[PDB]
Amino acid sequence: PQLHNGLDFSAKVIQGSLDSLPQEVRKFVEGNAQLCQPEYIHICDGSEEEYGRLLAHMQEEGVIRKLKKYDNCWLALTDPRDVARIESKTVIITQEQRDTVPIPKSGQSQLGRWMSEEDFEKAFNARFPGCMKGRTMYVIPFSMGPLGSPLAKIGIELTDSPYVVASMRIMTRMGTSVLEALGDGEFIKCLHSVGCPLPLKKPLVNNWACNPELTLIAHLPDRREIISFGSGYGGNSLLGKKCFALRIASRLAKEEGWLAEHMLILGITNPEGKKKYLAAAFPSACGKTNLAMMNPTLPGWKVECVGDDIAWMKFDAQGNLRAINPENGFFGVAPGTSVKTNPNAIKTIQKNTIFTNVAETSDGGVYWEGIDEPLAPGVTITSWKNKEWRPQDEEPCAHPNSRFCTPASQCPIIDPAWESPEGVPIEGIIFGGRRPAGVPLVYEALSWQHGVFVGAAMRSEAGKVIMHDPFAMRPFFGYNFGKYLAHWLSMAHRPAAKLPKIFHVNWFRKDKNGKFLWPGFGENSRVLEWMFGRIEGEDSAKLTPIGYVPKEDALNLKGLGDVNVEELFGISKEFWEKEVEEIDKYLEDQVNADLPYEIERELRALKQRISQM
Numbered sequence: 001p002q003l004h005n006g007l008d009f010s011a012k013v014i015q016g017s018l019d020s021l022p023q024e025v026r027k028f029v030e031g032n033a034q035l036c037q038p039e040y041i042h043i044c045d046g047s048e049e050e051y052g053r054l055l056a057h058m059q060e061e062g063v064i065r066k067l068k069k070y071d072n073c074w075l076a077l078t079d080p081r082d083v084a085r086i087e088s089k090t091v092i093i094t095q096e097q098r099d100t101v102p103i104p105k106s107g108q109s110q111l112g113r114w115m116s117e118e119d120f121e122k123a124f125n126a127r128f129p130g131c132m133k134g135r136t137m138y139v140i141p142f143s144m145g146p147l148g149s150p151l152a153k154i155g156i157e158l159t160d161s162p163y164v165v166a167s168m169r170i171m172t173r174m175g176t177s178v179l180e181a182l183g184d185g186e187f188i189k190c191l192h193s194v195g196c197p198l199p200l201k202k203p204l205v206n207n208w209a210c211n212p213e214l215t216l217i218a219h220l221p222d223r224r225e226i227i228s229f230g231s232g233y234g235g236n237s238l239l240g241k242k243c244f245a246l247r248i249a250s251r252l253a254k255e256e257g258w259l260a261e262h263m264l265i266l267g268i269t270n271p272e273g274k275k276k277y278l279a280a281a282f283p284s285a286c287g288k289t290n291l292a293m294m295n296p297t298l299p300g301w302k303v304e305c306v307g308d309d310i311a312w313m314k315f316d317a318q319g320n321l322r323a324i325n326p327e328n329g330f331f332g333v334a335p336g337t338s339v340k341t342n343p344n345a346i347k348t349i350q351k352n353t354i355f356t357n358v359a360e361t362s363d364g365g366v367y368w369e370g371i372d373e374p375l376a377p378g379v380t381i382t383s384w385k386n387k388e389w390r391p392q393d394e395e396p397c398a399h400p401n402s403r404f405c406t407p408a409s410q411c412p413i414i415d416p417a418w419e420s421p422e423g424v425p426i427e428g429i430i431f432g433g434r435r436p437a438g439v440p441l442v443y444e445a446l447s448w449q450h451g452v453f454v455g456a457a458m459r460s461e462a463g464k465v466i467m468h469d470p471f472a473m474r475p476f477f478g479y480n481f482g483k484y485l486a487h488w489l490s491m492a493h494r495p496a497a498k499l500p501k502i503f504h505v506n507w508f509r510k511d512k513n514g515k516f517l518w519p520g521f522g523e524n525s526r527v528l529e530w531m532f533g534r535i536e537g538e539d540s541a542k543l544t545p546i547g548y549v550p551k552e553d554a555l556n557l558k559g560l561g562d563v564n565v566e567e568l569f570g571i572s573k574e575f576w577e578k579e580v581e582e583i584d585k586y587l588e589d590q591v592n593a594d595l596p597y598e599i600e601r602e603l604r605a606l607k608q609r610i611s612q613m
């Protein structure tokens with residue numbers, strides 16, 4: 001309907017048709033075109049042609065550089081103001097604050113950031129009107145999870161960033177077939193703008209459009225909407241990555257009886273052909289990608305990657321905990337990725353990969369701190385800041401949060417079931433963190449409820465600072481963490497549910513001198529072997545106040561040197577008295593009225609067991 005000419009955006013569509021879009025998709029696209037005023041609308045088809053052309057166009061405009069050493073690899077260097085997810089500008093909108101975050105007893109909440117609907121509407125009106133003037137609005141239809149999966153969920157992302165389009169093609173399954181699969185079904189509304197309408201009011205830095213001062217990443221779970229403004233970077237712009245897959249999804253999971261978790265998924269096979277799938281939640285910088293793509297040292301063992309970041313998990317009718325990786329690629333921290341640390345990642349990123357904020361070598365290759373391979377004499381480096389770089393320099397050549405964005409299918413050890421619509425059966429869940437002192441290499445929770453507590457109690461070294469990161473979900477809870485705990489605990493009361501064994505690992509315990517007590521990397525397969533046997537009901541465990549640890553001689557330590565098993569598995573009453581006390585204070589403050597009875601009980605139990613040693 002029109003008395004004039006200015007609501008139908010059909011004349012502005014440069015690929016696809018508004019008419020062919022499902023009713024509700026058209027309304028989403030058109031309504032936002034009316035608001036943001038793009039010059040053009042491009043309905044993404046996800047084709048190789050679309051992709052290659054968009055890359056070459058970004059290359060034309062100096063937005064990306066081609067890396068000539070590799071096969072179809074690209075490099076983007078950002079405005080230094082726009083280099084990471086910004087938690088302090090990340091918010092969830094609900095009617096009641098308590099539905100989003102528990103109300104703390106003493107201080108400020110570390111478990112989320114609530115914004116009122118009233119405050120958001122003002123913030124929105126101050127940002128989005130006219131924001132895409134002079135730019136193309138790209139419409140990205142994407143599936144989170146295998147296209148056929150009953151566990152999968154579909155989104156539509158509108159963006160004015162070609163970089164976002166290119167990265168979303170890698171990180172999700174996107175294009176025409178998603179629109180066709182969707183039909184008149186429900187979808188998550190994802191709206192993004194770099195917030196730099198043309199003509200530019202402010203200087204463009206490093207050909208990277210962004211609006212740091214107005215950056216805001218919002219989630220409206222009740223409206224099924226993600227709305228993000230001002231950042232073109234990673235988690236802020238690739239709206240499938242954290243906004244959808246963790247924040248919105250955890251809330252949907254809560255409603256629908258499943259789990260959306262910050263977990264890798266791997267499949268491990270023993271030398272007798274028996275295969276098990278495990279999930280693991282680690283905070284930042286704890287070797288998550290390393291574990292997911294591990295090359296095991298133990299003969300006859302195999303490790304295969306399903307995913308390295310997000311797990312969507314639901315018990316089936318038979319009581320199996322079925323998991324899918326909702327992503328289509330890996331968005332990994334580049335620095336520290338070497339042949340020693342992650343050889344399978346090295347093989348993956350050789351081809352069809354977008355790199356962000358890494359150094360470039362003079363022969364068109366990539367470089368970063370901790371890459372652990374020398375350059376031929378003559379090969380020079382250009383840093384992520386587009387300046388000549390030298391190993392003697394005080395500044396890093398790559399940004400510490402620099403990234404590779406690579407197709408999952410390219411992983412040489414990608415699991416054969418990684419896109420099976422039914423998902424894979426999880427038999428073990430692993431929590432862990434960086435703890436230089438006190439916390440043994442591996443322990444097993446005494447029960448499901450103790451296991452939930454272990455997840456709740458997670459702390460990790462960020463003078464250094466040890467901080468809480470329960471379930472590795474601290475920046476990602478879609479709703480009240482106490483209710484999230486209650487949601488986990490409720491799984492035990494599902495009849496037929498086969499509850500996975502819960503373990504906790506510490507690869508990072510140091511001796512008195514500051515030296516790691518565990519070699520790690522591929523040797524972590526020895527810990528995985530113990531876990532495997534424990535799931536199989538093997539008598540390989542010793543009871544301690546914190547859970548079960550390996551018996552003496554239970555862990556395969558052959559081929560290692562003289563590993564200090566005494567200091568590695570040592571548990572001190574003094575350390576754990578302090579540990580349980582600060583967990584108690586943290587939970588009381590941060591979770592307060594919403595702490596489930598069973599978590600308090602697990603806490604009392606632990607205090608009691610420690611009091612008796």
Ligand SMILES: O=C(O)CCP(=O)(O)O
Binds near residue numbers: 085233
């Ligand atoms: O969201 C981002 O930009 C970073 C993703 P991660 O924190 O999993 O490396």
Ligand SMILES: [Mn+2]
Binds near residue numbers: 262
């Ligand atoms: Mn992550």
Ligand SMILES: [Mn+2]
Binds near residue numbers: 489492493598
């Ligand atoms: Mn119970």
Ligand code: NA
Binds near residue numbers: 078206
């Ligand atoms: Na740039």
